[PDB]
Amino acid sequence: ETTALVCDNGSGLVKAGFAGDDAPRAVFPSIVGRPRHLTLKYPIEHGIITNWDDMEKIWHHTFYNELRVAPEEHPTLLTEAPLNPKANREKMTQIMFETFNVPAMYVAIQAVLSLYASGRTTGIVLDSGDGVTHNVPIYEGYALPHAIMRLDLAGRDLTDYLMKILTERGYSFVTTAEREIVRDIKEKLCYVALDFENEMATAASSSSLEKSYELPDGQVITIGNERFRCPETLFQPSFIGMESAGIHETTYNSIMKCDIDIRKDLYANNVMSGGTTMYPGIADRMQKEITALAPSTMKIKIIAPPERKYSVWIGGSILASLSTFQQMWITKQEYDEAGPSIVHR
Amino acid sequence: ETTALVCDNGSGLVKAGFAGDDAPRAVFPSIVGRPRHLTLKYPIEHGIITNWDDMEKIWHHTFYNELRVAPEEHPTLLTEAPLNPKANREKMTQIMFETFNVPAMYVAIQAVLSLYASGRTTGIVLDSGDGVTHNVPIYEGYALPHAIMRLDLAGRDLTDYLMKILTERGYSFVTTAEREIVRDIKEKLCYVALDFENEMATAASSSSLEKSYELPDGQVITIGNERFRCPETLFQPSFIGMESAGIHETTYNSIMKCDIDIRKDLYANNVMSGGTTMYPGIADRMQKEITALAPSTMKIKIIAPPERKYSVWIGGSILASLSTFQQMWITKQEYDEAGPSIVHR
Ligand SMILES: Nc1ncnc2c1ncn2[C@@H]1O[C@H](COP(=O)(O)OP(=O)(O)NP(=O)(O)O)[C@@H](O)[C@H]1O
Ligand SMILES: Nc1ncnc2c1ncn2[C@@H]1O[C@H](COP(=O)(O)OP(=O)(O)NP(=O)(O)O)[C@@H](O)[C@H]1O
Ligand SMILES: C/C1=C/C(=O)O[C@@H]2C[C@@H](CC[C@H](C)/C=C\C=C\CC1)O[C@@](O)([C@@H]1CSC(=O)N1)C2
Ligand SMILES: C/C1=C/C(=O)O[C@@H]2C[C@@H](CC[C@H](C)/C=C\C=C\CC1)O[C@@](O)([C@@H]1CSC(=O)N1)C2
Ligand SMILES: [Ca+2]
Ligand SMILES: [Ca+2]
Ligand SMILES: [Ca+2]
Ligand SMILES: [Ca+2]
């Protein structure tokens, strides 16, 4: 009766802890600091692990520094982005079994876990983090891969934009340290307008939408239409020069690519996952926009769990603990025996 | 548990004492007197040791005459000017280990120690003494060498100028003894004008800025705009026929040569070191001038420690005593073993 580990590796944050817990004990940056003779590196670009040696370092820091546990004494549940290439998943397995000597392991799809966290086996998930946005449709637990929509625009991109659009008010946020200041602003004051034009007009004509922000040094600053113009990019990505359709449109597209029988259920089950879905008013805006694109008689529902910055991790805590999941693990025996081509079944 | 020595060799003064002390016990002229059959020699020109046999004499006078200690019984911390040539540093090491038989030693950068004395690991230092003026930017303890600005104009040059500009009032300061009298005037009455033209006008139209000076022989003399015209040379070196940009401009230039990420911090951390930064009102003038050249939204701060004539020495007292510095010493064993090429790492 040993304890299972759940480690959710995202582009910005690593979320880690023990299965069965309500929340992860460790939440820290997915970064590997390097010198010029910091110079940070984000090992995971757009939800995909791009540098493996750096990634080994984060896992090493997860077990020994953060969780303070022995890797070979706990079965480990890792998480991956939707449509992660085969070879990527095999490499994770190779590293855990050989370099960390884990007794058992399994790699789960992030969007699916989020759904599970909402108590659902079927629905369409909007998972938008720091590095990538996905629309993942799911039926009876299985993610339909031909219907998944990806969008390389998330929190970091929204932070970069807000830095830009604060410069036109006269402020000067350009450094990496100053960027973390803007990220805080984004997380504290930004919201999604129910109707952009109206909202731009309310900002143009009055000061009712202005808020004060106390900087580290003690000075206070004012921000206006930026509050909703920043997260608006989600609905209109051409603000930052991207022709990609908005999140609401890709949600519609994700649903239309699916079998007709399941769409009614998908529409009825729009779960939101990830930190970039935490903007106040994002739930009302998605309802509105989804209604416009859909047929008139469709019942639309957008589920937005309050703890949705950690829905994935939670999904894995719940899964790792389930009785029906224990059979699906990969023992070190199975791996050494069967090999990398066993993590597909 | 033997006591460590700290010896700061400057162009004008030698500052020496035991690590852990608040202030150095010995402060004396960096001069070697010679005859015509005095004729003084300053062994250190512009912060660089130029005559080694004379320099041996000052170190001999430091240990035996001034500090009254045995060189081979104390690890010795020497100081050097920014961008001191490799070969210069190797020669210091050779002399301490072979001629003074020191058990351990280390050579530190003056501007960096000053910073440490202010309780900072990062910032931009204005170190202006009797022979040289440097702008030294520093990040996480390391002095960025490509961003250091040098300026061969300090206290002695300001003293030579004041002797010149007192002649146009009718006084006759020309001899070496009389020069030390002018240096005293410079140190007692000179200040830096917040605005030169205004100040020249206040001197032209009234006598509110005049001060009396009691000479050695008992007679009193009056000095006016010279009080601020002398130190003004720092901000406008073309007063003494030098095309070099002023201290405020080189401070700006030193910052712009650095990586963009660190400039905000550099501006926020302008520490002043050396006797030529002791002019009353030099802190207000640097704030003013630095603001004009910088962007409008930049927070500028000029730190001016009251004990800043001995900031370097103090920096070394603090460093020599640190726990993390003990590993960085150079034992006589290491030197005799490894050789001169070990003092670079
Ligand atoms: N209240 C908030 N409002 C808006 N954005 C937020 C809020 N809280 C967190 N974020 C953003 O959420 C992002 C991190 O969330 P997370 O879902 O953990 O991303 P990730 O998993 O690290 N990377 P990815 O693989 O793209 O999910 C950052 O861009 C945060 O700034
Ligand atoms: N109150 C003062 N006002 C102006 N100048 C001063 C004052 N006190 C000392 N000085 C000058 O400070 C200089 C000596 O300071 P110091 O920083 O010890 O120079 P140094 O280290 O001997 N030579 P360097 O290697 O150039 O620093 C002399 O030119 C003094 O006249
Ligand atoms: C509370 C918090 C949340 C977070 O998500 O940080 C992550 C990680 C962070 C790493 C680089 C910074 C300097 C190091 C320190 C961080 C502490 C964690 C900060 O880079 C992000 O900020 C990026 C860049 S700017 C943005 O919008 N996303 C996301
Ligand atoms: C209190 C004091 C401070 C000092 O800094 O002296 C140093 C050393 C001094 C050496 C020559 C004189 C005669 C010898 C005696 C000195 C006693 C120390 C005098 O030559 C300076 O004066 C030069 C020349 S004139 C000037 O402006 N810098 C700087
Ligand atoms: Ca994620
Ligand atoms: Ca568009
Ligand atoms: Ca000096
Ligand atoms: Ca000039």
Tab-separated table of N, CA, C and O and ligand atoms in Angstrom, chain B residues 236 238 242-244, ligand 8:
chain	number	residue	atom	x	y	z
B	236	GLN	N	32.028	69.004	-16.274
B	236	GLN	CA	32.483	69.574	-17.538
B	236	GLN	C	34.020	69.576	-17.583
B	236	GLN	O	34.661	70.554	-17.210
B	238	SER	N	36.067	69.848	-20.010
B	238	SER	CA	36.722	70.780	-20.942
B	238	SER	C	37.190	72.074	-20.275
B	238	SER	O	37.857	72.879	-20.916
B	242	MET	N	40.112	68.976	-21.511
B	242	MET	CA	39.875	67.571	-21.793
B	242	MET	C	38.541	67.433	-22.490
B	242	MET	O	37.543	67.980	-22.024
B	243	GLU	N	38.526	66.692	-23.597
B	243	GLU	CA	37.300	66.494	-24.383
B	243	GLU	C	36.405	65.377	-23.823
B	243	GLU	O	35.267	65.197	-24.277
B	244	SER	N	36.904	64.647	-22.828
B	244	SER	CA	36.150	63.563	-22.215
B	244	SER	C	34.786	64.049	-21.714
B	244	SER	O	34.672	65.145	-21.152
C	8	CA	CA	33.144	69.076	-23.128
